[PDB]
């Protein structure tokens, strides 16, 4: 919903093979595509942790009553069957809810990955690039596939195009 309202590109890039999200460059080279591995790994780890959490749930076994005998205690055994059934029903619903919320979380965070990737791109491009607001930046220089690959790797330096750069704090 965020991207839809904000005018983010609603389509996707088949070229993006090595990952889930990343960058595209648009110029005289046509169109280059590079996956960002950091963002992809982050998503994968969240999902993995999410899987672990769902797998940690433990519920009591449902077994026979030790004292209720067939024929002699049929009425009791009918109620016992009812208890088993309602238990299976209730825990099932609770699990479906847990899985539902997990999936809601995963799908929703996509636009947040883009927003984060946009911050990473902004710093690397330097103060000479212009922010359009739709997840795209306008640059003074050409960026072919080779240039994009260094952006995705975080090694891109605007100084190589004789453009100003932001320095990183020594921490």
């Amino acid at each position: 919903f965020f991207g839809a309202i904000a005018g983010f590109l609603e389509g996707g890039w088949e070229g993006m093979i090595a990952g889930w999200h990343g960058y595209t460059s648009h110029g005289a080279h046509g169109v280059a595509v590079a996956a960002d591995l950091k963002s992809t790994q982050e998503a994968i780890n969240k999902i993995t942790k999410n899987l672990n959490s769902l797998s940690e749930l433990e519920v009591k076994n449902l077994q026979r009553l030790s004292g209720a005998m067939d024929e002699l205690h049929n009425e009791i055994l009918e109620l016992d069957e009812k208890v088993d059934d309602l238990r299976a029903d209730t825990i099932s619903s609770q699990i479906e809810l847990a899985v539902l919320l997990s999936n809601e979380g995963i799908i929703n965070s996509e636009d947040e990955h883009l927003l984060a990737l946009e911050r990473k791109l902004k710093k690397m491009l330097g103060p000479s690039a212009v922010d359009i607001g739709n997840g795209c930046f306008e640059t003074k220089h050409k960026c072919n596939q080779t240039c994009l690959d260094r952006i995705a790797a975080g090694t891109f330096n605007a100084g190589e195009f004789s453009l100003p750069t932001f320095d990183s704090l020594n921490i």
């Binding site: 969240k46 942790k49 999410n50 672990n52 959490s53 997990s102 979380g105 704090l169």
Partner: peptide, 19 residues
Amino acid sequence: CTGITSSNSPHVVKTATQG
């Protein structure tokens, strides 16, 4: 810059996406 504090953190809680 924006920043977050750092202090002794002996307490543990469970999360869905960060363990």
